[PDB]
Design a protein around this ligand. Structure first.
Ligand SMILES: O=C(O[C@H]1CCSc2ccc(Br)cc21)[C@H]1C[C@]2(CN1)C(=O)Nc1ccccc12
Ligand SMILES: [Zn+2]
Ligand SMILES: [Zn+2]
Length: 394
């Protein structure tokens, strides 16, 4: 796995991407690593924000599936044409896979100026593949066509005219022990669609938010490398911000800061980290009534952004924000942690990342077990629509 270490790059807040080739001869593209979706789709026509794109007609190994695909997210949408081609990851396993590729022909609010990526690698399960769950996702094909074990793991690492470069590692087919310290702890995948998990408790500097735990997973809780923020359901967000405000209250920031839409600054080197609390999410353990906590620092959730104007200051954006589609454990959370996507055993592992950003007094932590007698059910059950209900799955 030494050859897959540091195989991710990107810009702070605009996605981690891995180099991939599609086609014969191979066409190199930079592809967003995204565990919140299940499609492999690449830019396939010119776009203001794209340096380059997939040219189907130039690949002798392309096959057109003669079928269209459309995916709107809450933010971002793309469509294109389905097909298959030969795909490899140069800084990945030494294999070539024939995979489904969606060749994006239109899009809105999908590509990001300056991000340097030209498509997306959805690494979540077939159930949220578009246009339906019969479109085999990339990782499924990789595992079916090769010897690669059904597991990958992500080490995302944190960090004046451009945003900060970031770096990471996607270890395809296992677990590199140099990327974490201490214990690896697993939380069960509730269901194989998103990487859906259950949060059973939240503390801010050790104070329990004391909400009904279903609130934390309303309407789900997912791990998503392709989301920058820790995003929280309305009610949890509001309680969380009220608590972080209270701890930090020696500093009186603008509304726009807490809305994640404005920077706040201190003289270089003088940021009063100590006034911002740590946040602990307790995740369901593998054993009934057990849980473990992951503890992130303000270093993770206060995101560095250099000011052109006050480039002499350390400035930060608030990278916790509100959600209407459940808790999203985004790059904020993930940057604390080496995260193991153990599809084979239907679980997700967390250990303290060997590259997480911390200080002299606090570290990001993964700690357990913690026990609960008569642990209620903290899962939410999403209302089933007639659309969803009507689909057959043969
Ligand atoms: O979480 C994700 O998609 C979810 C969002 C909830 S709506 C929905 C509906 C269907 C499917 Br399939 C997934 C999702 C992916 C896509 C992502 C970030 N990760 C995003 O949301 N916009 C965006 C924009 C650019 C890149 C990545 C992303
Ligand atoms: Zn049928
Ligand atoms: Zn099905």
């Amino acid at each position: 796995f030494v050859e897959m270490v540091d195989n991710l790059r990107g810009k702070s807040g605009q996605g981690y991407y891995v180099e991939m080739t599609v086609g014969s001869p191979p066409q190199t593209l930079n592809i967003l690593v995204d565990t919140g979706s299940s499609n492999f789709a690449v830019g396939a026509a010119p776009h203001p924000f794209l340096h380059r794109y997939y040219q189907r007609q130039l690949s002798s190994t392309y096959r057109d599936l003669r079928k269209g695909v459309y995916v709107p997210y809450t933010q971002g949408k793309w469509e294109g044409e389905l097909g298959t081609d030969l795909v490899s990851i140069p800084h990945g396993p030494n294999v070539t896979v024939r995979a489904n590729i969606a060749a994006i022909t239109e899009s809105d609010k999908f590509f990001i100026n300056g991000s340097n990526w030209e498509g997306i690698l959805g690494l979540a399960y077939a159930e949220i593949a578009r246009p339906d769950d019969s479109l085999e996702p990339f990782f499924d094909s990789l595992v079916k066509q090769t010897h690669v074990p059904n597991l990958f793991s992500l080490q995302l690492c944190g960090a004046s005219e451009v945003l900060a470069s970031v770096g990471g590692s996607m270890i395809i087919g296992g677990i590199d022990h140099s990327l974490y310290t201490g214990s690896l702890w697993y939380t069960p995948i509730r269901r194989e669609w998103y990487y859906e998990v259950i949060i059973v408790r939240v503390e801010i500097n050790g104070q329990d938010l004391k909400m009904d735990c279903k609130e934390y997973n309303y309407d789900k809780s997912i791990v998503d490398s392709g989301t920058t923020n820790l995003r929280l359901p309305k009610k949890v967000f509001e309680a969380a911000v009220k608590s972080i405000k209270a701890a930090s209250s020696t500093e009186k920031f603008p509304d726009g800061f807490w809305l994640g839409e404005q920077l706040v600054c201190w003289q270089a080197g003088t940021t009063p980290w100590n006034i911002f609390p740590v946040i602990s999410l307790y995740l369901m353990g593998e054993v009934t009534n057990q849980s473990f906590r992951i503890t992130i620092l303000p270093q993770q959730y206060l995101r560095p952004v250099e000011d052109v104007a006050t480039s002499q200051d350390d400035c930060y954006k608030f990278a916790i924000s509100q959600s209407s589609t459940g808790t999203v454990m985004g790059a904020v959370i993930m940057e604390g942690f080496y995260v193991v996507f153990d599809r084979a055993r239907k679980r997700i592992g967390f250990a303290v990342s060997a590259c997480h950003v911390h200080d002299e007094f606090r570290t990001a932590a993964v700690e357990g077990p913690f026990v609960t007698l008569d642990m209620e059910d903290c899962g939410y059950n999403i209302p089933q629509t007639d659309e969803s209900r009507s689909h057959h799955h043969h």
